[PDB]
């Protein structure tokens, strides 16, 4: 009998460890593996792929499809704001609900770029050129076209490819910013503008719709994973 | 049969482990797998697309 | 390790990176310099933390169940299913086909029952938990020869010590685990529909080894299950509501998302 | 020169030709492919039709209204009854195939919609009385589109597929049915849609009719909206090819 | 393949993108580029504020009516309240810069209208 | 090995090492033998008790709470303070930024409070402890589905045996834990102001598991924390004063030393 | 099973001891380290600097 | 002393465990072994023998 | 004298052992003997029979 | 290892595999293939649990 | 891959450890590290000092 000594915390259970247990069945006999398509080895590739964004979440919106569609029409004045929303993926109700917010709901700390892509679905006959802004955070949301400028922004034309894609660049004074809503760090205000009025033929409709997809750029990250908010049950299921 | 293995370490250290069961269900999980690639869900589409040309053409 | 971004500087060119088209459905793949001029930094970020085996590695308690050294229910008996607790259940269906080695931990707890005895002495409580594959003769009284587990696997446990361990091999007639079926049980259609269908992993039974009092005693016993070297296909998308049954995917209709005041407005 | 939105694609004695597509989509990277013999569970040499199996089938069409929520099909339904692909079937206790997806819809310039094509592996319908399970001519359509209902099903007791748009029936947000394969048509961008997908299932072979795989799904994201005048009818068309079809369990027709 | 009519130019944090352009326009032929030494008349080290400056400024736009005579803007007091730009001529006595100038215009295929976009040295109105 | 005298004989000369200057703020450096005559002396003492990992690598008892099995209070919560303990706080506060793992073990002991009901049974009360990072729903009630923990760490303890232990890797969003925060929680300065604006450590819960006996029994839990591979920099003052909130430095003021009779005299 | 013998002391706790336990969390990425200026290695280095001495302490 | 920990489930007893266990009888000298016909290492060998089968197994 | 051996593993991963015992008895079973021979009980006749020849001639 | 059966080809033959006698008391030996046209399948199933050690060393 | 380290000893004699983890957060506190440098906090001002000069000159 060799001599042994006890460490603190002999007998105790972790969650999360990591040890060797004997199985219940000695030299079971397992089913052979076979080809399935789309294996999975890390949650950020799922994120990598664009999610539908619920832009319009307001009232009885959320209820009909109209939530993801943006409203656009041909206006008398240009410098009109045609949306505003929180840079942050997982607090914000915007963002919350969709593929890379689900996945962060998940995990207490992210970090890296987003991409926004915004797609078009008007007539052909239908032309315009909208401002889409991100602004760094310490400054007030902007709350005119000339203020959004300054914030860095993309000019995009309508025709031609349908689709744009604004990178928000990561701007942080912190390696990591927390996915629930920190004052320390704030991620940012992304705001869209009319660079110019929407025209159109006559027998074509003045207004139309704008989709907006999201997602985890390469450079993007996440730690400490933590249980979901979401998801509850007050009783085990039947 | 003793295994050394590198430990979980910061950037800018080897751990020993032995399996003392035959059932090779009764080991430990595989955490050290860090292999992804995007390419199955993103860019699915059969004709490759270069990242700066019109999209359709 | 994460991609580090590439420094970058004005230019003017033929060419467009930020145009794409969404109907291909290619995803569109653009870095931060292609849109602005940005600075070589470099990333030590590790994807550590996102693989899907350490997402999937931590005990949680899929059940638990109370039975009683005296009176008419002196066993419980519960069938073995991960859909009946919600976490467990959502994080499983993120995967269409999973395939993974389940890791066993029993935790049991007994409370004296308040009673009219008096002068009660208790010797130490023995727990037997007894494992049946489908058709195994299920005990109908705590008395049985089913107790006697000779074909059976089981465990003994002696109160006051480290909680019961057991690893299991991957069973299924299946090669992979289906987390969703779009099925009927029999060819002609009529029947149950779901996931139930394929429902066939054997039944959990726990007992009193010995009384050691008269006095009523009732234990409850938790079961935790812990993936291990996991493997995932098809991913789906995440469930987006509260569960209603664990036999099947039935839901009442839920609202996209919370509502903000305006499309403006950057508050919840 | 060539367009890359120019496209022929010629399966069996069909051959089908758009002048506008979108790139074609494989979903996983994978090309559909006759099953291994180091996979192969059964002993028994498996038939192989070849060109007869493998040929465009052109379903029924539909009407694409200013307020249609949606409309769905379960594809092994769908090809259930029709030429020798319906009858081989029929005849054999074991069924694997790949199977192509074309979606055609047309419209004037002026005209403006956009409708979603995915194809989703083991959607699961949910009824809406909890507990009921959903009734078998309510999950699947023969010969006909089955529609999504924008409102969801009424208060009720009884068998009934819960219907409702934003859920898809699968009680999944609608925006997040990205990650399954699918090809978007705008109007102003796309004629029409090409989705490829491998066969995918946990066995190796599976009875058809017991067990489906895929469900084709198209919603409008966008309604369809046009000026006074304009043609008021829109007619969507989905043509489904099987590829790669094999046979096995030579067996007596009908399921029971 | 590439289309001669589409374009993108990317200054500082700011990037234009226009679908259908006319080819770009280098007045003399010469780009512009930093003072020479050999010709540089001042002693003292100038400061160059790099990509603050460089970047580009949206003004406010005009209205194209079927009777619009014309429309006319002095480019250095157009910039002179703008961004740091504004702030770093105010603060300095010396600034000699390039200019880069884009005029966007969207209409329906069915309207028909020719604008002339001209930039003159030394105008005196 | 600390630095060894050396011998030294009388000598007359220009340089003068005892004169300096304090203007400069450059700290005079002169051995005894400069001053005066000297004898060669090696040293074998050693400065290896003062070093940063050795003065920090000790448990202290950071916090304790108490929860009870019956009664409205079945649970307690503490928020994850280095500050609330005196001893922790000052020599953790004599460096600015400070980088290190954190060991911790939690000593559970039970007591029987005395109450009317009689001929009680007591089964051995199992203790769970469950952290929570920040935005995990809190518990509201002590029989929550947040107690299932499956996205959550936790530790069960059974009553007689060694007390649980969990290592913890540096945890900050900053390269480095700050002792001291000059700044304001937003851009505006109005508002808190202190260190309290970067604590988002997360919060721990303890419940008793199961219920032994009829009788209440009180538990206290005690919290330790040992610096483990510390890294310092920036080393400030001794802090001189009384502690008075764990959220600001706020003091009352305080005489510099005690006091002597005369400045010639030697008592205090 | 090896057999064993439990040393006298076996489950108890000092607070001066130096072991090995199981991390909370698997496999944790720590934030990368940077350069701080005064970086500090012993106790003793503090003592050196010189400090003001209180010598006329009485009273006021 | 070698410092040690205490995985979860020890002193637990499983019907299907495989450990090293002392003989109550220390050095016995079994009986030696001797030819037997028909020996048997797998189950499935006898299975692969034919059974009569009582196929009209209605009523007497 | 540590003995080195394979584990249960599936298809399409060393445990070591050590006997600290001299009783012999007191071994773990030879779970892992994978070896069959059904030709006593099946074809037990003295004359070869082939697979496809008249049983009877 | 369980054994793998060999792809077969439809032929006619002198040769009665099928064909047997019970008296003799060999048990007939014959794979799926004589009976029927097969395809060459590999089989990774391992007699493993019905080894007589496994299945008597159970408490 | 056991290290062999020297103990702490008095003046005027190894321990073995090995790690049985990978988390590499889970090992021993590094006692062992006696370096200091007063530099940085004495003799801070740029141009060097001798010991016997006139301190201002
Ligand atoms: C001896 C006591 C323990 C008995 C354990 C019996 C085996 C249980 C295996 C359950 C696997 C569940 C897999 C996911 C859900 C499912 O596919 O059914
Ligand atoms: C699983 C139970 C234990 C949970 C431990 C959670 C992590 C606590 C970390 C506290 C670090 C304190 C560092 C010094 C003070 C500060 O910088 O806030």
Redesign the pocket.
């Given at each position: 009998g060799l001599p042994t000594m006890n460490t603190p915390g002999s007998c105790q259970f972790l969650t999360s460890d990591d040890f060797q247990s004997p199985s219940?069945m000695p030299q079971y006999d397992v089913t052979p593996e076979m080809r399935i398509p789309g294996e999975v080895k890390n949650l950020m590739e799922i994120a990598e792929v664009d999610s539908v964004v619920p832009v319009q979440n307001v009232g009885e919106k959320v209820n009909s499809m109209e939530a993801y569609q943006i409203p656009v029409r041909s206006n008398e004045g240009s410098g009109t704001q045609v949306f505003g929303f929180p840079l942050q993926p997982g607090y914000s109700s915007v963002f919350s609900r969709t593929l890379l917010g689900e996945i962060l709901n998940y995990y207490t700390h992210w970090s890296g770029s987003i991409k926004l892509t915004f797609m078009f679905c008007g007539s052909a006959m239908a032309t315009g050129k909208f401002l889409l802004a991100y602004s760094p955070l310490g400054a007030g949301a902007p709350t005119k076209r000339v203020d959004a400028m300054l914030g860095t922004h993309v000019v995009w034309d309508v025709g031609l490819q349908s689709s744009c894609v604004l990178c928000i660049p990561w701007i942080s004074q912190t390696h990591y910013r927390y996915v629930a809503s920190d004052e320390c760090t704030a991620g940012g205000f992304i705001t869209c503008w009319y660079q110019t009025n929407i025209v159109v033929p006559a027998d074509a409709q003045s207004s139309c719709y704008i989709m907006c997809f999201v997602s985890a750029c390469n450079d993007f990250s996440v730690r400490l994973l933590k249980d979901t908010p979401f998801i509850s049950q007050e009783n085990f299921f039947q | 049969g003793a295994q050394v293995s590198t430990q979980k370490t910061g950037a800018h250290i080897h751990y020993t482990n032995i399996n003392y069961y035959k059932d090779a269900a009764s080991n430990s999980a595989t955490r050290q797998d860090f292999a992804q690639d995007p390419g199955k869900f993103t860019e699915p589409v059969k004709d490759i697309m270069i990242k700066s040309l019109p999209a359709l053409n | 390790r994460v991609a580090d971004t590439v420094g970058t500087g004005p230019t003017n060119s033929e060419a467009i990176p930020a145009l794409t088209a969404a109907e291909t459905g290619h995803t569109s793949q653009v870095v931060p310099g292609d849109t602005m001029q940005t600075r070589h930094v470099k990333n030590y970020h590790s994807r550590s933390e996102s693989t899907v085996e350490n997402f999937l590695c931590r005990s949680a308690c899929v059940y638990f169940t109370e039975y009683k050294n005296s009176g008419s229910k002196r066993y419980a008996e519960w069938v073995?299913?991960?859909?009946q607790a919600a976490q467990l259940r959502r994080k499983?269906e993120f995967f269409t086909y999973?395939r993974?080695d389940?890791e066993?931990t029993?935790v049991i707890t007994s409370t004296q029952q308040p009673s009219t005895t008096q002068n009660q002495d208790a010797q130490i409580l023995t727990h037997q938990?007894?494992?049946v594959?489908p058709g195994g003769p299920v005990p109908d009284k705590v008395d049985s020869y089913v107790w006697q587990t000779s074909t059976?696997?089981?465990?003994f446990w002696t109160e006051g010590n480290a909680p019961p361990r057991?690893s299991?091999p991957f069973?299924?007639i299946g090669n992979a685990?289906?987390?969703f079926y779009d099925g009927w049980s029999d060819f002609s259609r009529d029947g149950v529909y779901g996931?139930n269908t394929?429902?066939?992993?054997?039944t959990?039974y726990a007992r009193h080894v010995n009384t050691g009092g008269t006095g009523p005693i009732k234990s409850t016993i938790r079961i935790y299950?812990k993936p291990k070297h996991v493997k995932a296909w098809i991913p789906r998308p995440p469930r987006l509501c509260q569960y209603e049954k664990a036999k099947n995917v039935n839901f009442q209709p839920s609202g996209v998302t919370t509502t903000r005041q305006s499309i403006t407005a950057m508050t919840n | 020169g060539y367009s890359d939105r120019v496209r022929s694609i010629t399966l069996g004695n069909s051959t089908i030709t758009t002048q506008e597509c979108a790139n074609v989509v494989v979903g996983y990277g994978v090309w559909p492919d006759y099953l291994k013999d180091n996979e192969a569970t059964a002993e028994d040499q498996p038939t192989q039709p070849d060109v007869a199996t493998c040929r465009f089938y052109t379903l029924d069409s539909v009407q694409w209204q200013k307020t249609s929520p949606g409309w769905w099909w379960k594809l092994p339904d769908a090809l259930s009854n029709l030429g020798l692909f319906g009858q081989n079937m029929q005849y054999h206790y074991l069924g694997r195939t790949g199977y192509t997806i074309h979606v055609q819809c047309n419209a004037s310039k002026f005209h403006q919609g956009c409708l979603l094509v995915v194809c989703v592996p083991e959607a699961e319908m949910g009824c809406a009385t909890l507990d009921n399970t959903p009734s078998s001519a309510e999950l699947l359509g023969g010969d006909a589109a089955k529609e999504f209902a924008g409102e969801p099903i009424a208060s009720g007791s009884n068998k009934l597929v819960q219907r409702v748009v934003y859920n898809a029936g699968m009680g999944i947000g609608v925006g997040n049915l990205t990650i399954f394969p699918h090809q978007w048509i705008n109007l102003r961008t796309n004629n029409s849609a090409t989705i490829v997908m491998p066969y995918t299932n946990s066995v190796p072979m599976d009875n058809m009719f017991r067990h489906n795989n895929v469900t084709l799904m198209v919603i409008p994201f966008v309604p369809l909206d046009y000026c006074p005048g304009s043609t008021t009818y829109v007619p969507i068309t989905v043509t489904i090819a099987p590829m790669n079809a094999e046979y096995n369990g030579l067996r007596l027709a009908g399921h029971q």
């Open positions: 219940a | - | 073995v299913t991960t859909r499983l999973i993974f389940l066993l029993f938990i007894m494992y594959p059976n696997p089981s465990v057991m299991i069973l299924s685990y289906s987390n996931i394929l429902n066939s992993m054997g959990l299950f | -």
